[PDB]
Every structure is written in C-alpha cells, then in structure tokens.
Amino acid sequence: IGWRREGIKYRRNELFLDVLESVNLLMSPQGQVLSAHVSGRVVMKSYLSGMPECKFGMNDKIKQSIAIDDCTFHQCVRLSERSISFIPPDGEFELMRYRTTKDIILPFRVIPLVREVGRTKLEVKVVIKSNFKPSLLAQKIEVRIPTPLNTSGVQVICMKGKAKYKASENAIVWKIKRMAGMKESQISAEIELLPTNDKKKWARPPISMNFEVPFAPSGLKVRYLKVFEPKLNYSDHDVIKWVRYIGRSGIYETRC
C-alpha cells in the first residue's frame, strides 16, 4: 500500500473527522430560492495502530437522510446500504469531496426593506433570522448592504453588533460576533444622497452575508467510523473518536 507504511504504533489510538461545507445561495426579493447548493469535504486525521480497515457511514440512504448529487474519493477508498471502505493514510488526509442541492438548510434568512424618501434619503431596514438549533451558535457574522454611488453619508442603528459605512467598498457592513439559533436581529440605516442624473436608475445589488456555523448545512451527519485491525489487539471501542462540523458561507446573496 503506497499511501501507508507498515509499522505504525500509537498508545492512544485516536481519530478526527472534519466535515467542511461551504453553503451557497441566491434568493429573490420574494423569498424564493433561485439557486442553492453545498460543497463539502470530509477530512480525517488518524493516529491508529497498524494498518486498520475503517468503515465510514453517514446519513445517506438518500429523522435524517441526505441526498448527494455527486462525490469523489481518495484512492485508498474501495468503491463498493453500501458504504465507504478504506485503509487510511496516517496523519491527515481528504477522504471524500461532495456536492449537494436538495433539502439544504439555509442557516440564515435575510429580510430587507427599503423606503425611498423623495430624492434625499433612502430608509433601509434589514432583518436577519437564524434558522437552527438554539443550542448552536453562529460565529463571525457579517451582513453587507450596498449603497448607491451618490451616497453622501450614512447613519445606522443596530442593537446587536457594529456596523461601519465603508465608502470605498460602497457598502454598509454590519458585524456580529455570535448569534444563536432561532433568533432575530435587525439594523436600520438612513442613507443620505447627493443629487444625481435622474435618468440612470440604481441597480440594487444583493445583500450578502458571511457566517460560520457548527453544523453541515447539507444535513449530512456522521454516523460511524468503524475501525478493525485484525492482527493487533485493539478494537473499535479502543479508539477515541471525534468528529466536528464547520459550515460556512460561500456565496450567500439575497436580492432586494
């Protein structure tokens, strides 16, 4: 086996899995999801004794059960429910890579509201809502609200987080360190406008977010990682096993 040498021993047989997903979304002003998908990989870190034969199972019949549009594996994987089998390399490696479009969890919903006030002001309210177990925290949230090019200034109020108006980037940026499942937050801004060429209207680009969440928005869950080394005297239960999910936004736009 050219990916794993032959005499590895560890007193503490222990492995680590990372399910890394990036969630993507294009949503219309009327709440319809125009397009959405998730890309993910599973990375494993293993410090197991021998040349063990592991079995990776997750929620894929296709409660909990998810549908994978496609995916590729690491050579060590023996192709042929029917689950994934391999003798992994030692250390850290990319077990599989996958894609997904159905029954995806959109961790965040964004609700924009905008009010034209004569020719001087825009009034904008934006609400974000977290869609997930309240026991879970999202971290590193940013909402990004574009302003027209004739903005002379911006005032905003927001009871959670901080938001700076950023002229170079032509956007209001709201940042929240942590926020829990099933909650709501909002921001209000008033945008003061220079005069402009009446004729060319403003093309409102989407409001966009960045966030990181501790679960796989594809819904994928790890169920088991069975280890078997037949020559040596450690069994599956001897193995300490950890798993952790890091879901993050890719592109996540909402049109107003």
Partner: peptide
C-alpha cells in the same frame, strides 16, 4: 467554539 470537536459512538 465553532471548530470544537465532539466525541461520537
């Protein structure tokens, strides 16, 4: 913390 490991199994 996001990025924290959970035991399973």
């Amino acid at each position: 913390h996001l990025g924290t490991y959970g035991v399973f199994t």
